[PDB]
Amino acid sequence: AAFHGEVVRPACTLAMEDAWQIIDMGETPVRDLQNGFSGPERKFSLRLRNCEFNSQGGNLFSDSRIRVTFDGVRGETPDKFNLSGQAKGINLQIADVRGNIARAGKVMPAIPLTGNEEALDYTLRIVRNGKKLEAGNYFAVLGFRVDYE
Amino acid sequence: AVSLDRTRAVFDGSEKSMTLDISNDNKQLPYLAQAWIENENQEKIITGPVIATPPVQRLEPGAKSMVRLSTTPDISKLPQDRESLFYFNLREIPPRSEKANVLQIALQTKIKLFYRPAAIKTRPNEVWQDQLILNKVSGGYRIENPTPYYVTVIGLGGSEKQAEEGEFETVMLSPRSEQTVKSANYNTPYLSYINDYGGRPVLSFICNGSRCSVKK
Numbered sequence: 095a096a097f098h099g100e101v102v103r104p105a106c107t108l109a110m111e112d113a114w115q116i117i118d119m120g121e122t123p124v125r126d127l128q129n130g131f132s133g134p135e136r137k138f139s140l141r142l143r144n145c146e147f148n149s150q151g152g153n154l155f156s157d158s159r160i161r162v163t164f165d166g167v168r169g170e171t172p173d174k175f176n177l178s179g180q181a182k183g184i185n186l187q188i189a190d191v192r193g194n195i196a197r198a199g200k201v202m203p204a205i206p207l208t209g210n211e212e213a214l215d216y217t218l219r220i221v222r223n224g225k226k227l228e229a230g231n232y233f234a235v236l237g238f239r240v241d242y243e
Numbered sequence: 244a245v246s247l248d249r250t251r252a253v254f255d256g257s258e259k260s261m262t263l264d265i266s267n268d269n270k271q272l273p274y275l276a277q278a279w280i281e282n283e284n285q286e287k288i289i290t291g292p293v294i295a296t297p298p299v300q301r302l303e304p305g306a307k308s309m310v311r312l313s314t315t316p317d318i319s320k321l322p323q324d325r326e327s328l329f330y331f332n333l334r335e336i337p338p339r340s341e342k343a344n345v346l347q348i349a350l351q352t353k354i355k356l357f358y359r360p361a362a363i364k365t366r367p368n369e370v371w372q373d374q375l376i377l378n379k380v381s382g383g384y385r386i387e388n389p390t391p392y393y394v395t396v397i398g399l400g401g402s403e404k405q406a407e408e409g410e411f412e413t414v415m416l417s418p419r420s421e422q423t424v425k426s427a428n429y430n431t432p433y434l435s436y437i438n439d440y441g442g443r444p445v446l447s448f449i450c451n452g453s454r455c456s457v458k459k
């Protein structure tokens with residue numbers, strides 16, 4: 095069509111496996127934590143759709159056309175997030191595919207993506223927060239903020 | 244789940260309001276969407292001079308809706324000869340799962356919102372970005388934006404392909420301002436920028452000594 099109305103790039107819609115946009119963390123990893131380790135790793139994939147995320151040379155994330163940030167309550171260190179619920183002695187850690195740890199409210203570094211997929215991949219794990227462990231149920235809502243250039 | 248229909252918004256100062264379409268792309272679950280404005284410092288604002296309504300709404304699975312931006316009389320206090328920058332924010336509230344041991348993710352979308360006064364109103368596809376000037380300096384370029392508009396620069400290389408695909412730290416030039424950018428020297432610089440529609444055109448520059456301007 096030579097002649098037509100304005101067509102603009104839409105912002106990305108976020109798609110996950112789970113309809114609630116939830117990652118199951120599993121039972122509090124008490125044994126693992128007491129041996130001085132973190133809990134087991136939990137993969138989560140965010141797909142960013144409808145924004146033509148991929149282009150011939152790269153993608154919006156790796157090119158710094160969008161900036162992403164995890165928003166939440168800082169835990170014990172800048173590298174940790176706070177958790178709600180009855181459990182005690184625990185924080186969450188989020189890492190990217192090169193092992194860069196997310197800090198609450200700080201922009202993730204632009205890195206090139208793997209399996210040239212349309213997806214952002216993150217890893218979470220439960221870590222100690224220095225307080226005494228009381229096993230129990232935990233939860234968190236994390237903001238995932240996409241700032242558009 | 245909740246998405247916005249654009250990656251930047253231009254508010255035409257000759258009108259009193261505009262709308263942005265939003266959508267719940269989750270076809271299974273209702274999501275709430277909160278909408279608010281922030282000022283150029285990304286500090287929140289609520290009484291003016293631009294407001295977003297409704298500030299919260301419920302979207303049924305698959306539903307389409309909108310958010311409206313309007314101006315208050317205090318809008319007249321902004322400069323009339325240059326753009327002002329705000330941010331529009333759209334943050335979903337996912338439905339609560341009462342599931343044990345879960346992490347729930349909530350998208351927030353933050354876009355630039357350019358208030359463009361009536362006196363500097365533009366036509367469809369108008370290009371002012373070709374008025375940029377590059378100046379070579381130690382370690383890079385001082386880029387001058389003499390225009391009344393914000394200009395977002397996302398590429399700078401020695402060919403078109405380098406402008407579009409080369410590594411470059413995105414930088415936004417305020418109206419009538421200049422900024423220094425770390426860069427290799429390029430014989431014939433190409434510069435990529437984002438336009439009002441979210442497209443990424445490229446401009447070809449020619450240098451006379453340290454000063455570079457767009458090929459007429």
Ligand SMILES: O=C(O)[C@@H]1CSc2c(C3CC3)c(Cc3cccc4ccccc34)c(CN3CCOCC3)c(=O)n21
Nearest residue numbers: 274275276277297298299300301302335336337338339
């Ligand atoms: O509280 C909760 O668990 C959830 C998450 S936040 C929230 C808000 C909202 C964050 C404050 C509102 C308030 C709210 C929601 C949608 C549209 C609105 C329009 C105007 C005013 C309020 C609206 C709620 C009220 N409802 C909505 C209809 O079902 C009964 C419970 C609500 O449950 N919730």
Ligand SMILES: [Co+2]
Nearest residue numbers: 095096097098
């Ligand atoms: Co066309």
